[PDB]
Design an enzyme around this catalytic site. Structure first.
Site, PDB file in Angstrom:
ATOM      1  N   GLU A  23       0.908  -1.104   0.098  1.00  0.00           N
ATOM      2  CA  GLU A  23       0.021   0.150   0.063  1.00  0.00           C
ATOM      3  C   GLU A  23       0.611   1.228   0.071  1.00  0.00           C
ATOM      4  O   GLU A  23       1.053   1.907   0.999  1.00  0.00           O
ATOM      5  CB  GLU A  23      -0.947   0.131   0.974  1.00  0.00           C
ATOM      6  CG  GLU A  23      -2.064  -0.767   0.944  1.00  0.00           C
ATOM      7  CD  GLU A  23      -3.117  -0.971   2.031  1.00  0.00           C
ATOM      8  OE1 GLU A  23      -2.847  -0.200   3.110  1.00  0.00           O
ATOM      9  OE2 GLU A  23      -4.286  -1.648   1.847  1.00  0.00           O
ATOM     10  N   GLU A  42      -5.803  -7.520  -1.202  1.00  0.00           N
ATOM     11  CA  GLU A  42      -6.393  -7.198   0.190  1.00  0.00           C
ATOM     12  C   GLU A  42      -7.687  -6.585   0.179  1.00  0.00           C
ATOM     13  O   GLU A  42      -7.739  -5.480  -0.293  1.00  0.00           O
ATOM     14  CB  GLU A  42      -5.385  -6.472   1.134  1.00  0.00           C
ATOM     15  CG  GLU A  42      -5.555  -6.821   2.516  1.00  0.00           C
ATOM     16  CD  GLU A  42      -4.823  -5.962   3.421  1.00  0.00           C
ATOM     17  OE1 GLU A  42      -3.640  -5.962   3.417  1.00  0.00           O
ATOM     18  OE2 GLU A  42      -5.791  -4.977   4.085  1.00  0.00           O
TER      19      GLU A  42
HETATM   20  O1  LIG Z   1      -1.790  -5.697  16.882  1.00  0.00           O
HETATM   21  C1  LIG Z   1      -0.743  -5.709  16.152  1.00  0.00           C
HETATM   22  C2  LIG Z   1      -0.377  -4.153  15.613  1.00  0.00           C
HETATM   23  O2  LIG Z   1      -1.931  -3.904  14.930  1.00  0.00           O
HETATM   24  C3  LIG Z   1      -1.619  -2.494  14.398  1.00  0.00           C
HETATM   25  O3  LIG Z   1      -2.783  -2.330  13.603  1.00  0.00           O
HETATM   26  C4  LIG Z   1      -2.928  -2.795  12.275  1.00  0.00           C
HETATM   27  C5  LIG Z   1      -4.364  -3.501  12.273  1.00  0.00           C
HETATM   28  O4  LIG Z   1      -4.726  -4.496  13.300  1.00  0.00           O
HETATM   29  C6  LIG Z   1      -4.556  -4.060  11.019  1.00  0.00           C
HETATM   30  O5  LIG Z   1      -5.904  -4.565  10.730  1.00  0.00           O
HETATM   31  C7  LIG Z   1      -4.283  -3.088   9.759  1.00  0.00           C
HETATM   32  O6  LIG Z   1      -4.192  -3.549   8.758  1.00  0.00           O
HETATM   33  C8  LIG Z   1      -4.063  -2.898   7.469  1.00  0.00           C
HETATM   34  C9  LIG Z   1      -3.013  -3.425   6.528  1.00  0.00           C
HETATM   35  O7  LIG Z   1      -1.637  -3.578   7.074  1.00  0.00           O
HETATM   36  C10 LIG Z   1      -3.157  -2.816   5.158  1.00  0.00           C
HETATM   37  N1  LIG Z   1      -4.400  -2.858   4.554  1.00  0.00           N
HETATM   38  O8  LIG Z   1      -5.352  -2.091   5.643  1.00  0.00           O
HETATM   39  C11 LIG Z   1      -5.517  -2.766   6.763  1.00  0.00           C
HETATM   40  C12 LIG Z   1      -6.479  -2.054   7.547  1.00  0.00           C
HETATM   41  O9  LIG Z   1      -6.165  -0.783   7.842  1.00  0.00           O
HETATM   42  O10 LIG Z   1      -3.069  -2.335   9.976  1.00  0.00           O
HETATM   43  C13 LIG Z   1      -2.911  -1.882  11.169  1.00  0.00           C
HETATM   44  C14 LIG Z   1      -1.463  -1.020  11.289  1.00  0.00           C
HETATM   45  O11 LIG Z   1      -0.378  -2.028  11.123  1.00  0.00           O
HETATM   46  C15 LIG Z   1      -1.575  -1.444  15.412  1.00  0.00           C
HETATM   47  O12 LIG Z   1      -1.385  -0.133  14.976  1.00  0.00           O
HETATM   48  C16 LIG Z   1      -0.431  -1.862  16.517  1.00  0.00           C
HETATM   49  O13 LIG Z   1      -0.321  -0.640  17.387  1.00  0.00           O
HETATM   50  C17 LIG Z   1      -0.376  -3.201  17.040  1.00  0.00           C
HETATM   51  O14 LIG Z   1       0.760  -3.539  17.543  1.00  0.00           O
END
Ligand SMILES: OC[C@H]1O[C@@H](O[C@H]2[C@H](O)[C@@H](O)[C@H](O[C@H]3[C@H](O)CNO[C@@H]3CO)O[C@@H]2CO)[C@H](O)[C@@H](O)[C@@H]1O
Length: 300
Positions: A136, A225
């Site tokens: 992305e 995705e």
């Molecule tokens: O719990 C692990 C970490 O998660 C982080 O948040 C993530 C979300 O859980 C996840 O669903 C999101 O997924 C994205 C993907 O990477 C790209 N496409 O879009 C999806 C939906 O936005 O990604 C988040 C960020 O990585 C969180 O920010 C951390 O604090 C946690 O450790």
């Protein structure tokens, strides 16, 4: 059975086809970040997804930043485990260089080239492999023509030196939504597809129309995705809009991987707290999202 039957994938007239020229649609799951939820990625869980859900592709989401590969490269070995499992299970596998906070793919391009050299050297004589070189791209300072296309034109030749024609998925601007600009300025390689990502918590009618615009330029699109949640990965479940997208993808021969295979307490997660990381999940152990996604793949 899947990979034996379909074999070498290619792009013909903007469509994913098998080695006998027939359209084929891949449907499967993405891992969450391998640095956070890698325990869910293993032969046994992938076999359960294949047998019980009917998946025919698995996406290994190797974050680069956020504690991922750049910070700790050991997670590349989990990608290898996933690829090997897909080979053993006779399903396709997406190797995803999962940029996000590192919003310009050029930030870690040297490392990306190294990584894709290694992966294509190891796996370039298997038909299972699909390379996703930049999850992305995002930010107004990251455009197709200025940033993403020339990144792809550095990484693609590294892969092609080892693997001349497995599919390469290339991310698009604005979190892999801006397929319009990519489709107007396509890459040369004939076995490229452009990523499109959606979240069902966003009203999607114009996004569908933009995918159709891109398809009408002869660009191939892989929905590498998508989620049933809002764009954050959380914020409730939106199954009505998800179904509209499912039907759209079927009508347009669009392959897809759903986000994501984890027990995290967020709406897009497929599994409940307490789901076994090696598979075997009861109805009660699937989340609202997972139950739906499983049904969609079993229906297929
Ligand atoms: O719990 C692990 C970490 O998660 C982080 O948040 C993530 C979300 O859980 C996840 O669903 C999101 O997924 C994205 C993907 O990477 C790209 N496409 O879009 C999806 C939906 O936005 O990604 C988040 C960020 O990585 C969180 O920010 C951390 O604090 C946690 O450790």
């Amino acid at each position: 059975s899947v990979v034996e039957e379909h074999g070498q994938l290619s792009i013909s007239n903007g469509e994913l086809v098998n080695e006998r020229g027939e359209q084929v649609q891949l449907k499967g799951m993405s891992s969450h970040g391998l640095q956070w939820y890698g325990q869910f990625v293993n032969y046994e869980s992938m076999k359960w997804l294949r047998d019980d859900w009917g998946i025919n592709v698995f996406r290994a989401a190797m974050y680069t930043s956020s504690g991922g590969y750049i910070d700790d490269p050991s997670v590349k070995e989990k990608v290898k485990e996933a690829v090997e499992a897909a080979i053993d299970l006779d399903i396709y596998v997406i190797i995803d260089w999962h940029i996000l906070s590192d919003n310009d793919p050029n930030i870690y391009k040297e490392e990306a080239k190294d990584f894709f050299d290694e992966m294509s050297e190891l796996y370039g004589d298997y038909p299972n492999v699909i390379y996703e070189i930049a999850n992305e791209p995002n930010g107004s300072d990251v455009t197709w023509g200025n940033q993403i296309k020339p990144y792809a034109e550095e990484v693609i030749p590294i892969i092609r030196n080892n693997d001349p024609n497995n599919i390469i998925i290339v991310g698009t601007g604005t979190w892999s939504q801006d397929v319009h600009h990519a489709a107007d300025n396509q890459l040369a390689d004939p076995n490229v597809m452009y990523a499109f990502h959606f979240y069902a918590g966003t009203h999607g009618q114009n996004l569908r129309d933009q995918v159709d615009y891109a398809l009408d330029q002869g660009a191939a699109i892989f929905v590498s995705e998508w989620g049933t949640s809002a764009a954050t990965g959380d914020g409730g479940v939106f199954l009505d809009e998800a179904q509209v997208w499912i039907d759209f993808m079927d009508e347009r021969n669009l392959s897809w991987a759903n986000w994501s295979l984890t027990h995290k307490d967020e709406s897009s997660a497929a599994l409940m707290p307490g789901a076994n990381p090696t598979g075997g999940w009861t109805e009660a152990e699937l989340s609202p999202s997972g139950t739906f996604v499983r049904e969609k793949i079993r229906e297929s």
